[PDB]
Amino acid sequence: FVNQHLCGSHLVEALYLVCGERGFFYTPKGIVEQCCTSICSLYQLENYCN
Amino acid sequence: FVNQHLCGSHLVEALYLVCGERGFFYTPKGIVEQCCTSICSLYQLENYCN
Ligand SMILES: [Zn+2]
Ligand SMILES: [Zn+2]
């Protein structure tokens, strides 16, 4: 996985790819303050699939 | 397979800009049958925001 800062529509694109079929929930808040202002791993990103 | 997959990618991105700060919930069921085969405006997409 790209060990990078995922911000704006780049964050919803990743979530989209990782969560596949499941779907996901996007909430400008804790996913932000850490996957954007910080770096997240496949792992951490998967906390947002439905 | 291909088709709806490509299409949802285009939708999450449209729901990012529309929804803004209320975020959203993406579920490949409801949405894609509605908006992949026919055009769906920004107007129509806010159905889908939180
Ligand atoms: Zn960009
Ligand atoms: Zn495309």
Curated annotation (Swiss-Prot), chains A, B:
Disulfide bond annotation, renumbered to this chain: C7-C36, C19-C49, C35-C40
Protein name per the record: Insulin
Domain of life the protein comes from: Eukaryota
Function, as annotated: Insulin decreases blood glucose concentration. It increases cell permeability to monosaccharides, amino acids and fatty acids. It accelerates glycolysis, the pentose phosphate cycle, and glycogen synthesis in liver.
Family membership: Belongs to the insulin family.
Subunit and partners: Heterodimer of a B chain and an A chain linked by two disulfide bonds.
Subcellular location: Secreted
